[PDB]
UniProtKB/Swiss-Prot annotation, chain A:
One of its GO terms (cellular component) is ribosome. Found on the solvent side of the large subunit. This is Large ribosomal subunit protein bL34. GO terms for molecular function: structural constituent of ribosome. The gene is rpmH.
From Swiss-Prot, chain B:
Keywords: Ribonucleoprotein, Ribosomal protein, RNA-binding, rRNA-binding. One of the primary rRNA binding proteins. Required for association of the 30S and 50S subunits to form the 70S ribosome, for tRNA binding and peptide bond formation. It has been suggested to have peptidyltransferase activity; this is somewhat controversial. Makes several contacts with the 16S rRNA (forming bridge B7b) in the 70S ribosome. PROSITE patterns: RIBOSOMAL_L2. GO terms for cellular component: large ribosomal subunit. The gene is rplB. Belongs to the universal ribosomal protein uL2 family. Transmembrane segments: none annotated. Residues 229-239 have a biased composition (Basic and acidic residues). Residues 222-272 are annotated as: Disordered. This is Large ribosomal subunit protein uL2. Part of the 50S ribosomal subunit. Forms a bridge to the 30S subunit in the 70S ribosome, contacting the 16S rRNA. May also make transient contacts with protein S6 during translation in the 70S ribosome. The lineage of its organism: Bacteria, Thermotogati, Deinococcota, Deinococci, Thermales. It comes from Thermus thermophilus (strain ATCC 27634 / DSM 579 / HB8).
Amino acid sequence: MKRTWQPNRRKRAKTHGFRARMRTPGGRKVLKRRRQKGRWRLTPA
Amino acid sequence: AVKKFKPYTPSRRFMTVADFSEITKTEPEKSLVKPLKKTGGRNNQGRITVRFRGGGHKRLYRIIDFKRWDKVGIPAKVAAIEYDPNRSARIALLHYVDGEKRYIIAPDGLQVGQQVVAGPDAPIQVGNALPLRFIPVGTVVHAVELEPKKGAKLARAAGTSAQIQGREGDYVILRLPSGELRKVHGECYATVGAVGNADHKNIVLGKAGRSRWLGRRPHVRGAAMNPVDHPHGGGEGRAPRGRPPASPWGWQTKGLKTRKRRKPSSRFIIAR
RNA sequence: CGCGGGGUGGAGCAGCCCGGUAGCUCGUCGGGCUCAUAACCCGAAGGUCGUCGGUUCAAAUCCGGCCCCCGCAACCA
RNA sequence: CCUACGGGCAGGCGCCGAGGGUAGGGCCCGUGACUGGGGCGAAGUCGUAACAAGGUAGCUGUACCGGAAGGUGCGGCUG
RNA sequence: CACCUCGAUGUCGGCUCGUCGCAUCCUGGGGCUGAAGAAGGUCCCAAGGGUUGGGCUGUUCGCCCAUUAAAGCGGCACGCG
RNA sequence: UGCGAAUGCCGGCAUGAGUAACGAUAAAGAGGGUGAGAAUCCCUCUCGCCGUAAGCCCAAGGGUUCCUACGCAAUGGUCGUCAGCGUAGGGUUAGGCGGGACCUAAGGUGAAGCCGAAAGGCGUAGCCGAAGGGCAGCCGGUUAAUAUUCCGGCCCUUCCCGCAGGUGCGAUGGGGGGACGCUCUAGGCUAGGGGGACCGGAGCCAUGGACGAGCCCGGCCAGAAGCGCAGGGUGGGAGGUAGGCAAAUCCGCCUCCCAACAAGCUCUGCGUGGUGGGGAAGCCCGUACGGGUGACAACCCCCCGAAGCCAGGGAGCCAAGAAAAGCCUCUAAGCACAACCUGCGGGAACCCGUACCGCAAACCGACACAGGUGGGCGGGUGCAAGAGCACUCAGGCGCGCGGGAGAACCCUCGCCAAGGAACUCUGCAAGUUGGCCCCGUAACUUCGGGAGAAGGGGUGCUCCCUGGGGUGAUGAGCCCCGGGGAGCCGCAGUGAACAGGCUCUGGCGACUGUUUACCAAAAACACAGCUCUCUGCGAACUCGUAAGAGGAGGUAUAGGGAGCGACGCUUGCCCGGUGCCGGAAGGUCAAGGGGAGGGGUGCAAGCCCCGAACCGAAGCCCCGGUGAACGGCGGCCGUAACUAUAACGGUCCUAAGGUAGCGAAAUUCCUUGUCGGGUAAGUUCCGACCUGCACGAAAAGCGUAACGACCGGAGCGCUGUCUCGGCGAGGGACCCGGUGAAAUUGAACUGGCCGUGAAGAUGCGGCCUACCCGUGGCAGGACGAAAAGACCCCGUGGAGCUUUACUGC
RNA sequence: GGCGAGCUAGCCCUGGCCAGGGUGAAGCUGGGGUGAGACCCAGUGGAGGCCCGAACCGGUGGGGGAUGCAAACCCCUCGGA
RNA sequence: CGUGGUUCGUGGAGCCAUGGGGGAAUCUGGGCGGACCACCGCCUAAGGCUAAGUACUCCGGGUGACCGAUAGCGCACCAGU
Ligand SMILES: NC[C@@H]1O[C@H](O[C@H]2[C@@H](O)[C@H](O[C@@H]3[C@@H](O)[C@H](N)C[C@H](N)[C@H]3O[C@H]3O[C@H](CO)[C@@H](O)[C@H](O)[C@H]3N)O[C@@H]2CO)[C@H](N)[C@@H](O)[C@@H]1O
Ligand SMILES: [Mg+2]
Ligand SMILES: [Mg+2]
Ligand SMILES: [Mg+2]
Ligand SMILES: [Mg+2]
Ligand SMILES: [Mg+2]
Ligand SMILES: [Mg+2]
Ligand SMILES: [Mg+2]
Ligand SMILES: [Mg+2]
Ligand SMILES: [Mg+2]
Ligand SMILES: [Mg+2]
Ligand SMILES: [Mg+2]
Ligand SMILES: [Mg+2]
Ligand SMILES: [Mg+2]
Ligand SMILES: [Mg+2]
Ligand SMILES: [Mg+2]
Ligand SMILES: [Mg+2]
Ligand SMILES: [Mg+2]
Ligand SMILES: [Mg+2]
Ligand SMILES: [Mg+2]
Ligand SMILES: [Mg+2]
Ligand SMILES: [Mg+2]
Ligand SMILES: [Mg+2]
Ligand SMILES: [Mg+2]
Ligand SMILES: [Mg+2]
Ligand SMILES: [Mg+2]
Ligand SMILES: [Mg+2]
Ligand SMILES: [Mg+2]
Ligand SMILES: [Mg+2]
Ligand SMILES: [Mg+2]
Ligand SMILES: [Mg+2]
Ligand SMILES: [Mg+2]
Ligand SMILES: [Mg+2]
Ligand SMILES: [Mg+2]
Ligand SMILES: [Mg+2]
Ligand SMILES: [Mg+2]
Ligand SMILES: [Mg+2]
Ligand SMILES: [Mg+2]
Ligand SMILES: [Mg+2]
Ligand SMILES: [Mg+2]
Ligand SMILES: [Mg+2]
Ligand SMILES: [Mg+2]
Ligand SMILES: [Mg+2]
Ligand SMILES: [Mg+2]
Ligand SMILES: [Mg+2]
Ligand SMILES: [Mg+2]
Ligand SMILES: [Mg+2]
Ligand SMILES: [Mg+2]
Ligand SMILES: [Mg+2]
Ligand SMILES: [Mg+2]
Ligand SMILES: [Mg+2]
Ligand SMILES: [Mg+2]
Ligand SMILES: [Mg+2]
Ligand SMILES: [Mg+2]
Ligand SMILES: [Mg+2]
Ligand SMILES: [Mg+2]
Ligand SMILES: [Mg+2]
Ligand SMILES: [Mg+2]
Ligand SMILES: [Mg+2]
Ligand SMILES: [Mg+2]
Ligand SMILES: [Mg+2]
Ligand SMILES: [Mg+2]
Ligand SMILES: [Mg+2]
Ligand SMILES: [Mg+2]
Ligand SMILES: [Mg+2]
Ligand SMILES: [Mg+2]
Ligand SMILES: [Mg+2]
Ligand SMILES: [Mg+2]
Ligand SMILES: [Mg+2]
Ligand SMILES: [Mg+2]
Ligand SMILES: [Mg+2]
Ligand SMILES: [Mg+2]
Ligand SMILES: [Mg+2]
Ligand SMILES: [Mg+2]
Ligand SMILES: [Mg+2]
Ligand SMILES: [Mg+2]
Ligand SMILES: [Mg+2]
Ligand SMILES: [Mg+2]
Ligand SMILES: [Mg+2]
Ligand SMILES: [Mg+2]
Ligand SMILES: [Mg+2]
Ligand SMILES: [Mg+2]
Ligand SMILES: [Mg+2]
Ligand SMILES: [Mg+2]
Ligand SMILES: [Mg+2]
Ligand SMILES: [Mg+2]
Ligand SMILES: [Mg+2]
Ligand SMILES: [Mg+2]
Ligand SMILES: [Mg+2]
Ligand SMILES: [Mg+2]
Ligand SMILES: [Mg+2]
Ligand SMILES: [Mg+2]
Ligand SMILES: [Mg+2]
Ligand SMILES: [Mg+2]
Ligand SMILES: [Mg+2]
Ligand SMILES: [Mg+2]
Ligand SMILES: [Mg+2]
Ligand SMILES: [Mg+2]
Ligand SMILES: [Mg+2]
Ligand SMILES: [Mg+2]
Ligand SMILES: [Mg+2]
Ligand SMILES: [Mg+2]
Ligand SMILES: [Mg+2]
Ligand SMILES: [Mg+2]
Ligand SMILES: [Mg+2]
Ligand SMILES: [Mg+2]
Ligand SMILES: [Mg+2]
Ligand SMILES: [Mg+2]
Ligand SMILES: [Mg+2]
Ligand SMILES: [Mg+2]
Ligand SMILES: [Mg+2]
Ligand SMILES: [Mg+2]
Ligand SMILES: [Mg+2]
Ligand SMILES: [Mg+2]
Ligand SMILES: [Mg+2]
Ligand SMILES: [Mg+2]
Ligand SMILES: [Mg+2]
Ligand SMILES: [Mg+2]
Ligand SMILES: [Mg+2]
Ligand SMILES: [Mg+2]
Ligand SMILES: [Mg+2]
Ligand SMILES: [Mg+2]
Ligand SMILES: [Mg+2]
Ligand SMILES: [Mg+2]
Ligand SMILES: [Mg+2]
Ligand SMILES: [Mg+2]
Ligand SMILES: [Mg+2]
Ligand SMILES: [Mg+2]
Ligand SMILES: [Mg+2]
Ligand SMILES: [Mg+2]
Ligand SMILES: [Mg+2]
Ligand SMILES: [Mg+2]
Ligand SMILES: [Mg+2]
Ligand SMILES: [Mg+2]
Ligand SMILES: [Mg+2]
Ligand SMILES: [Mg+2]
Ligand SMILES: [Mg+2]
Ligand SMILES: [Mg+2]
Ligand SMILES: [Mg+2]
Ligand SMILES: [Mg+2]
Ligand SMILES: [Mg+2]
Ligand SMILES: [Mg+2]
Ligand SMILES: [Mg+2]
Ligand SMILES: [Mg+2]
Ligand SMILES: [Mg+2]
Ligand SMILES: [Mg+2]
Ligand SMILES: [Mg+2]
Ligand SMILES: [Mg+2]
Ligand SMILES: [Mg+2]
Ligand SMILES: [Mg+2]
Ligand SMILES: [Mg+2]
Ligand SMILES: [Mg+2]
Ligand SMILES: [Mg+2]
Ligand SMILES: [Mg+2]
Ligand SMILES: [Mg+2]
Ligand SMILES: [Mg+2]
């Protein structure tokens, strides 16, 4: 029955995307973090 | 003067609708002078700040005219009386000789045909806006201004009036629909007559649904909540208030007065 | 079994707290007014205070046991 | 089968049909825990409404109230 | 009373399947009788086997209806999830 | 720095075990081929299953899964030569299809501006934002794999430039327009489908008959201009003009004059059309798919016909139904050797997607998971209709372990003599009933209902006669609705499939609705409606530190809070306490004002400190009001000419002592109260009494038609629920081949009884019994498994909740 | 201090969907009716949180499932439509 | 008056800072030495700049009674995979 993943490409980028992580200071930090740990991916694809 | 239905379905039984005879040919409520897209929206920026709202028919705002002094001395003929869904009252469409068209909140009386005028001049007959200092004592008048040039704000709901009981200083004394006794400035534009479509008080929605068409969602009694969400929520099978009855936010809701006292406007009031 | 209150002329209640006075209304008895009754007025009578103890100089009153009356509780299971 | 056969009788099917069954109505009678008023029955209880301004003139339609008669409001009549 | 069990011993009633005891409800054998016969009373032996169908209530129990030779009382983690 | 325990951590390997399972009971069988190997790959034939799908096209999502060659270690629940798997190579073509060099929507962002300790929050215009608006391609063929994309045919839009002809041209600005709901719905058409005796077509005559107006197959598709057909759109001229934030010659408005019609003009739809292309059965080829022929195919009449199109059509209704651009008109700067408009001609026309899966083995569910997933198409026949049901077309499937066997037992099914709720907590379950037409139908009622009440009859086929409609002509055909009559057959004609059991009577809730996603669907919530209360509008109220916003572009016939809950009849008494409301007096009271009076130090001037009276708010006190505000609404004793009983009285208390109505109740402890009813029997049910442990009037009181997957009682019908079981079917269980888990597990060589033992012993004691080891079965025991008991206590453990607990904000 | 409304709840903008049958409100027309009316009766008409019933939305009772096909499923039955 | 800082938690509570209120002087002026006064002294507020000694280790070197693949950084290995 309707599970919790209902992937939709526009929402995923609108929500977790790069351009979005960067307006909220709280997320510019998510990037700062992810970059420091050396995540090969700063954001979802 | 209000339509009744045989009970061919429960709710149709007691249900009762408006009379739309005053409505001179209408439907297409004329674009130009209104409509204007209306923003149905039940909360402010984010959060619900008036409870139990939303849903209900889509709506087109009729941009109605509340300052009437805008067109002193220019008369106008009255072309339509039509259904406005954003007020208890019905609205008169009036063609000016100026060429200009706008809407007015339709007084009890205006037949489709009258010339209507506004200004210190102007004959005292239903539909004509004057300043208040020039309207003769004892006249019922409506769509009143509270301070000169600020727009009509008093007595504009179907059937509401306001008698002018006296004059004193640059001010006149009205009885507003609330029974209150208020001094209003003399220069404030009022417009002679009562508001009309006055049976509106007597409609009976009839079923739950009708209350939603109207845009009002179900309203749940504190009584029926838990104590987390309302100062009346608990017991174990219906337990009296058990305190002086209260609103979700805590303040007492039976009797406790609310008007800010220091208000400047106090020095211009006198009743209930 | 638990807790609290109570028992006072015939009825219903004070007095018990703070030791030493027994009081109120009704009723009962005698006498008036009335043709008569009632109402009304004038007079009087009647209690050992549930009981056994104990304290005190002295106990309705302070203490304890027993006898009754009424009320409250008896929950997790 | 009989004949005096292009016949009759037996026999067969059919309509109607007393009544039997199933179903649901109507009307009347009897009866029933209990309950409502009513009549009647020498000397039971409570008050005093009415009859004499009945000691608050009476009566009256209505309405509310009250152990009970009754009282009260509104209007009416005069008996 | 608080002894094993709170790093779990699932609690009433029914149903199913029983098994045991005897302080015997019936049937078998008896003594005594205020036992004429018939039918009973009371006590003794006896556990082979039997010990009904319904109404009410979740009930066990009990009341009741119709019968019956009788419509037994208990134990088994108030036998048995 | 030494391990055996920490339900320790990490890893390895065991037990259960060749055990359960191998994922829908739509179903398989044989021949042939390939290969080391074949139930599992290919092919043929036969069988079965989907067909409002289990077929087909689109959108999401997915991301090489597409196509071909080669291959099988692993993935595939078996096998595997096969594959969505491995390796490699190929494959996605657009001015017109979708999106972008267009528009705006909620919302976002945001010059100006506002606010906030910083971070930041708001915000006019603007900008961004789409499945909405705007916008030009239809059809056939070709590829192993793409196609409205390549090709072919016919058709079209925009930009640039030029030539002609026309005009005051010109816009981010003005106006028109775009531009709009729901239900019903006219006409004409189209998609779609059926029939034909007509036109085309390979063949076919079996098995008793048929060479026949036989059978079987097919009889269209796209298409400019013109033209028909249907429908939408719309008045024309003149003057005045102060409104549409400049200006208009435009629009608005006033007068007047002409048509009032679609006449005219315009637009779309359908038809026809040049041209283009398709084109079955069957037979042959060879598939792993398709190709040849049929053929020079034919290509036509009739009927049924949308929910689609003409479209902005029409009527009714109340809840009263986006924006902006494209478009057109108007003008302003500006320019008018410009520019625009029209026609023609040349040229120019960019970016992204396009494979494939897409109700699923390619998406969301760890899985090739019986679950979930939006739009469109969805044929035929019958059944009254229909997207229902049965069968079926096209198309797609037999669900990736099999073979046998024919036990118990389990699941899903069918049937049962007599009985018929006797079962049980309860008719749970299952049965009965069941579509359509006709007859018929009660109490009660708010007059609509109750109603499918109830209870009944009819239902197939054949022949004869016969009425009306649509289409054609008024006719035949064809399609539709019937009416009457004589017959035939079976156990039975809605002959299969989909298709209510019913009545009586209480409780609660008026009603449709809503709810604890995943143990509660309810008598709970909501609900129209009633009442109280607040709020005069920069409203109250809510969110926010603010700005601001919601309320509301509302205004007391409105908005907030609270209770009650359709409707009928009603809703009593207490304001002493608490709440709120009112009260210009008085009492108290903080800072502050005020300083009489005192003190510290100085030689002194001074400097500095304490401080009475008195003037100083709200709050509280105090005075009053208020009950659809929180709330409350008595005790003893006596009394009548049998007796009981008490209308009457006495007395104590109170703020006042419960009115109407109701009452063993969703409330009654005693209690299975008592009486009546129902039953052979009634702790329940119904009626009644009142002794109300502990009913009672907006946490409403008492009723109420209708309504209910609520809950209680009773009856009829019918039954495997039962007396009481039996038989039968299929899927498992069993055996054989292939693959092969799990909780659990100190170690085991793991018996009964009677004892004992930490009080319930395979493990101690005595006695008894007992050859070793499996398999199918049953669940009494291993205080069997699971979960560090949820109950209970304990911890100066936690957390949600409350208030006249404390203390704060 | 940050991350979440791609599940779920509410609201906002914009689209879409609901076979087929039944019942027959107003209004309208006609007839009766009256001084005029109310009203009556036909026909027409097509209203409704109206009825039956698929899609679709549900989740009533029961059975099965319970190391499942499934960390909520399956079958029969049932509610709205 | 309200608070912060200092060892200072209103304490006899100064000093330094300052949200609010009132509000000077310029050497004979001002601040300070722990309520306040005197005396005796210290120091020049309301403007500013200033190397070094000091902190740290992404990074480079050198050492080790530091680890030796369950250790040692999570990663000795194409791991923030
Ligand atoms: N029969 C009279 C009717 O009913 C009522 O009358 C009845 C009663 O009111 C009346 O009762 C009366 C009473 O009022 C009066 N004040 C006392 C008197 N003793 C009683 O009377 C009764 O008493 C005894 C019993 O002991 C009987 O034997 C006697 O017959 C009977 N009348 O007795 C009547 C019936 O017996 C009304 N009074 C009257 O309005 C009406 O007309
Ligand atoms: Mg869904
Ligand atoms: Mg994921
Ligand atoms: Mg997941
Ligand atoms: Mg999207
Ligand atoms: Mg890298
Ligand atoms: Mg409510
Ligand atoms: Mg609750
Ligand atoms: Mg919360
Ligand atoms: Mg909250
Ligand atoms: Mg609270
Ligand atoms: Mg409460
Ligand atoms: Mg309660
Ligand atoms: Mg006494
Ligand atoms: Mg006396
Ligand atoms: Mg005397
Ligand atoms: Mg004594
Ligand atoms: Mg408790
Ligand atoms: Mg009587
Ligand atoms: Mg009198
Ligand atoms: Mg008298
Ligand atoms: Mg009198
Ligand atoms: Mg009277
Ligand atoms: Mg009395
Ligand atoms: Mg009078
Ligand atoms: Mg113990
Ligand atoms: Mg002990
Ligand atoms: Mg254990
Ligand atoms: Mg014996
Ligand atoms: Mg029973
Ligand atoms: Mg036994
Ligand atoms: Mg016991
Ligand atoms: Mg037991
Ligand atoms: Mg070890
Ligand atoms: Mg050890
Ligand atoms: Mg070890
Ligand atoms: Mg390994
Ligand atoms: Mg085994
Ligand atoms: Mg087995
Ligand atoms: Mg097996
Ligand atoms: Mg399978
Ligand atoms: Mg396909
Ligand atoms: Mg791949
Ligand atoms: Mg191959
Ligand atoms: Mg392999
Ligand atoms: Mg394999
Ligand atoms: Mg598998
Ligand atoms: Mg492939
Ligand atoms: Mg491959
Ligand atoms: Mg496409
Ligand atoms: Mg460009
Ligand atoms: Mg834009
Ligand atoms: Mg912002
Ligand atoms: Mg854009
Ligand atoms: Mg579009
Ligand atoms: Mg396009
Ligand atoms: Mg093609
Ligand atoms: Mg393809
Ligand atoms: Mg022009
Ligand atoms: Mg066609
Ligand atoms: Mg056709
Ligand atoms: Mg030929
Ligand atoms: Mg032959
Ligand atoms: Mg021939
Ligand atoms: Mg055809
Ligand atoms: Mg004109
Ligand atoms: Mg055409
Ligand atoms: Mg054409
Ligand atoms: Mg051709
Ligand atoms: Mg094939
Ligand atoms: Mg229209
Ligand atoms: Mg724009
Ligand atoms: Mg142009
Ligand atoms: Mg493609
Ligand atoms: Mg494709
Ligand atoms: Mg496909
Ligand atoms: Mg689909
Ligand atoms: Mg697939
Ligand atoms: Mg498919
Ligand atoms: Mg999957
Ligand atoms: Mg599979
Ligand atoms: Mg699946
Ligand atoms: Mg049918
Ligand atoms: Mg079907
Ligand atoms: Mg089939
Ligand atoms: Mg096929
Ligand atoms: Mg039978
Ligand atoms: Mg039979
Ligand atoms: Mg029967
Ligand atoms: Mg029974
Ligand atoms: Mg029984
Ligand atoms: Mg049933
Ligand atoms: Mg059935
Ligand atoms: Mg009924
Ligand atoms: Mg037929
Ligand atoms: Mg036949
Ligand atoms: Mg014809
Ligand atoms: Mg039915
Ligand atoms: Mg139904
Ligand atoms: Mg309900
Ligand atoms: Mg739900
Ligand atoms: Mg639930
Ligand atoms: Mg505002
Ligand atoms: Mg607004
Ligand atoms: Mg309520
Ligand atoms: Mg009351
Ligand atoms: Mg009070
Ligand atoms: Mg008071
Ligand atoms: Mg009070
Ligand atoms: Mg007598
Ligand atoms: Mg009670
Ligand atoms: Mg009886
Ligand atoms: Mg019960
Ligand atoms: Mg009471
Ligand atoms: Mg109550
Ligand atoms: Mg109340
Ligand atoms: Mg109620
Ligand atoms: Mg009731
Ligand atoms: Mg319902
Ligand atoms: Mg229900
Ligand atoms: Mg059976
Ligand atoms: Mg053995
Ligand atoms: Mg033992
Ligand atoms: Mg030993
Ligand atoms: Mg032993
Ligand atoms: Mg065994
Ligand atoms: Mg066992
Ligand atoms: Mg077993
Ligand atoms: Mg255990
Ligand atoms: Mg524990
Ligand atoms: Mg604590
Ligand atoms: Mg959401
Ligand atoms: Mg559909
Ligand atoms: Mg409905
Ligand atoms: Mg219904
Ligand atoms: Mg269910
Ligand atoms: Mg449920
Ligand atoms: Mg279930
Ligand atoms: Mg179940
Ligand atoms: Mg059904
Ligand atoms: Mg259904
Ligand atoms: Mg339905
Ligand atoms: Mg301190
Ligand atoms: Mg300062
Ligand atoms: Mg100095
Ligand atoms: Mg110093
Ligand atoms: Mg000093
Ligand atoms: Mg110094
Ligand atoms: Mg300086
Ligand atoms: Mg520096
Ligand atoms: Mg280093
Ligand atoms: Mg290693
Ligand atoms: Mg390591
Ligand atoms: Mg490092
Ligand atoms: Mg590691
Ligand atoms: Mg690496």
